[PDB]
Each structure stands twice: as structure tokens, then as C-alpha cells.
Design a binder for this molecule. Structure first.
Ligand SMILES: *[C@@H]1O[C@H](CO)[C@@H](O)[C@H](O)[C@H]1NC(C)=O
Ligand SMILES: *[C@@H]1O[C@H](CO)[C@@H](O)[C@H](O)[C@H]1NC(C)=O
Lengths: 141, 204, 94
């Protein structure tokens, strides 16, 4: 498939998933000036530049999103998985042959917060994931 | 020979897939159980469709109008589906010629709410405006129809191409009376389907 | 460390909470704490009180029926240090 069609599809995917996060987060409105400890393994506090960082961060986001038991969250997770596959397609498109290595998650704290802090985990994960997606959209061009 | 046309339908929320197909050439097989097989792909529909050796079944229900009905949940925005009709019986097995459908190519939106109109008595063009639905985010083209008010309506048709245009201007014949207008929207490229019409908004 | 973690009361009466914040091996004082609701609204300083050096007390007034938010049917209130909120919270039910 041509690369340009792929890029347009990626951009549309980011825009649609951001919109879903937005209208599902309107009832879960949060303020950025509130930091909650115990979620240091949720990313979003640093800018994202390199491809592998995006891949690993999106994998972590997918993991925490499927760690939550709700249908809409399942849909978000499925869309992020499709986004990750699209990003891998782009990475291979760039004609860089660094061997693919993925994984490396030891999320015991994830289970702890899920059994203790369902609501906070959900809202913080959604907010930081939306911020991350905005950063990727900013740096894609 | 055997042939089954396939039609699919997608709601505007991008959370439901509906597909429908006609049973018009299976009634003549006594004892023929029906069933459906669908195979998913990583990305995109391929060039030449074919039968995937590994598949997944999915039951379908019979409605009153005479069409088999079944759905998929949850759905994938950019994943290809390869599905077909299969018939099993006691003298072998026949497979139908399949058809590939992209989920994003059969999406229709909701009608556009908050349709209004007014007559600019100064100039003479009818002014109407709408708001695009939240989904899909892709650019859309709108078609407009107007007419008089009464039992029977002799409509007139017109369209607006520029997706960014939330306003329109239209040459008219009478202005002291009351007109009727509605709108509908669809994707610019051509994929998907028309989305009904809009609620009747009466002019003043 | 909350007491009580939840409460039940219909529309038409006040509310009462009590929290103590634990951080690592240090317990913060009370004069610095600020309350929070649903991580969306900050409560003006008129609505607090201090019983002793180690507890933050808040008394709400003319509570209104809560609005459902997804599958959830309760509103959460958090006691936080500066801008650092602990994971646990109290449950508000009307
Ligand atoms: C028109 O709208 C109604 C309800 O808004 C819906 O049930 C119907 O399916 C729509 N028409 C088409 C062709 O989808
Ligand atoms: C609630 O607070 C009001 C003043 O804010 C007070 O008058 C009343 O006695 C309190 N208790 C109730 C309403 O049960």
C-alpha cells in the first residue's frame, strides 16, 4: 500500500480516537494541576520523540486500558492496538531495519491500584493518554 | 451456479456493524442448514478475495421481511473482514463467491440537528444553516431540498460541496409565504450511504 | 486512612468527613491541606475546619442530588497535599 494513504489513515485514526476520549471524558472532567502518586508507571510527563518510545508507551497504555473492566474502555484499547500496528507499519516503511523488541512490563502495582483505585486509575490513564496522543499528533508532522 | 449479493450497514456511532443478505436461491435444497463464516485481517481488504482456511462462525436470525440478519460487536475501524455464505448438506459442500467490505467504507452518519431557516426580506435569497454530526470526522457534502407548504410537495433539489460551508444562499420565487427545507449529509469521496433527511423545520 | 469511608443521606442535609494523609514515613500537618471533589472542582476555604493538628474537617451545605457518571453512582472526595493526591478516597452517596 502507498505510504501517503497510510499516513492519512494514521492521522484520521489519531483524530477519531482523540475525539472519543474527549466525549467520554466530558463526564469525567479532570484538572491537570492535580497529581496523584502511585501511578509513576503511567507515562505522559515527558515529550515523545523517537519511534520506539511511542511504541512502548502505547503498549503500556493498551495494557492499563485492558486492565479496566468496561466496554468503552475495551473499544479504546482495540483502537490503540490498531494504532500500534499502524505505527509499526510506518516504522518498517522508514526502511530502518532495527530488530523488533517489545514487552517488558511487570505490573504488580497495576493490579494493586486496579483493585484499590479504579476511578483514579481510569481518569488519570485517560487524561495522560489523551495528552500523549496530542503530543504524537504535534510531532508527527 | 450460486450467487448471493452481500449488503452491510454501519451506524453513525461506529459501535455497531449490520450486514444483510438474501436467501433467494437456497430454498430449493431440502434439509440444507445455513451458517455464516467470517475471517478477519490485520489491515485492509486485499486485492483478490479468497477463502481463508481458518475462520470464525457467527449465527444469524431470521426477520419477518425475508432477510437473514446478524451483527458484529465490537467493530474495528481499519481492519478488513472477509466473509461469505456456506451451505452444508449430505452430498458435499458448496462455497459462495465472497465479497470484501471495509468497515469505514459503509458508514453513514446521523441527520444534522438544529436546522433553521429565515427569509432575508432585503435581498431575496433564502438563508439556512446546519451543524455537522460529531461522527464521522471526515469531510462531508450536503444536499438541500426546498418547496412550498401543503398536502403535496413539488420539491426542488440543490447541493453544497464545500464541507466547511455552514451557510447557503438560494434563489426563490415567493417570499411572503412559508417554505419548507431539510438537509442530509454524506462522505465526500463516495463511500458510505445517504443519511435519511432532516426534521421538518418551518419558516416564518 | 479515612473515617468514615462512606455515608448515606438524602437531599436536604449537610455532610461530614475526616481524613489524615500519610506520605512515606511522614505525616503532614493540617493547616496546609486542601480538599478536592471529583478532581474537577476546588472548594473555597470557607468550607473547612480544623479539629486538631492532624485532621482536616469539611462540612458541606445544601447538597444536591448527584448526577450519574458512567457506570459509577457515587462522587469521590480526596484529601491532598499541595497538589499531591493519595490514591484512596471516601464514598459519597445520596
Ligand atoms: C432514518 O432515521 C431513523 C431514525 O432516526 C432510522 O431508524 C432509519 O434507519 C434511518 N434511515 C435509514 C435509511 O437508515
Ligand atoms: C445543616 O446545616 C445548617 C446550616 O448550614 C443547619 O442550620 C442545620 O441544623 C444542619 N443540619 C441539618 C439540616 O440536619
Amino acid at each position: 500500500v502507498p505510504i501517503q494513504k497510510v499516513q492519512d489513515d494514521t492521522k484520521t485514526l489519531i483524530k477519531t480516537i482523540v475525539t472519543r476520549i474527549n466525549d467520554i471524558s466530558h463526564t469525567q472532567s479532570v484538572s491537570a494541576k492535580q497529581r496523584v502518586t502511585g501511578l509513576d508507571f503511567i507515562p505522559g510527563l515527558h515529550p515523545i520523540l523517537s519511534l520506539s518510545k511511542m511504541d512502548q508507551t502505547l503498549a503500556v497504555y493498551q495494557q492499563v486500558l485492558t486492565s479496566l473492566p468496561s466496554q468503552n474502555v475495551l473499544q479504546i484499547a482495540n483502537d490503540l492496538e490498531n494504532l500500534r500496528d499502524l505505527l509499526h507499519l510506518l516504522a518498517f516503511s522508514k526502511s530502518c531495519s532495527l530488530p523488533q523488541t517489545s514487552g517488558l512490563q511487570k505490573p504488580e502495582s497495576l493490579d494493586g491500584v486496579l483493585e484499590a483505585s479504579l476511578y483514579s486509575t481510569e481518569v488519570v490513564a485517560l487524561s495522560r493518554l489523551q495528552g500523549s496522543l496530542q503530543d504524537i499528533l504535534q510531532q508527527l508532522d | 451456479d450460486v450467487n448471493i449479493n452481500i449488503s452491510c450497514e454501519t451506524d453513525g456511532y461506529l459501535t455497531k456493524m449490520t450486514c444483510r443478505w438474501s436467501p433467494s436461491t437456497i430454498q430449493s435444497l431440502v434439509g440444507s442448514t445455513v451458517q455464516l463464516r467470517y475471517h478477519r485481517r490485520s489491515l485492509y481488504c486485499p486485492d483478490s478475495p479468497s477463502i481463508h482456511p481458518t475462520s470464525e462462525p457467527k449465527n444469524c436470525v431470521l426477520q419477518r421481511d425475508g432477510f437473514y440478519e446478524c451483527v458484529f460487536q465490537p467493530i474495528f475501524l481499519l481492519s478488513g473482514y472477509t466473509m461469505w455464505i456456506r451451505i452444508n448438506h449430505s452430498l458435499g459442500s458448496l462455497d459462495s463467491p465472497p465479497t470484501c467490505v471495509l468497515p469505514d467504507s459503509v458508514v453513514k452518519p446521523l441527520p444534522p440537528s438544529n436546522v433553521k431557516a429565515e427569509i432575508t426580506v432585503n435581498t431575496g435569497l433564502l438563508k439556512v444553516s446546519w451543524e455537522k454530526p460529531v461522527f464521522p470526522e471526515n469531510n462531508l457534502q450536503f444536499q438541500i431540498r426546498y418547496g412550498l407548504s401543503g398536502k403535496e410537495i413539488q420539491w426542488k433539489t440543490h447541493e453544497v460541496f464545500d464541507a466547511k460551508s455552514k451557510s447557503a444562499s438560494l434563489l426563490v420565487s415567493d417570499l411572503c409565504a412559508v417554505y419548507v427545507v431539510q438537509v442530509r449529509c454524506r462522505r465526500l469521496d463516495g463511500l458510505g450511504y445517504w443519511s435519511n433527511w432532516s426534521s421538518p423545520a418551518y419558516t416564518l
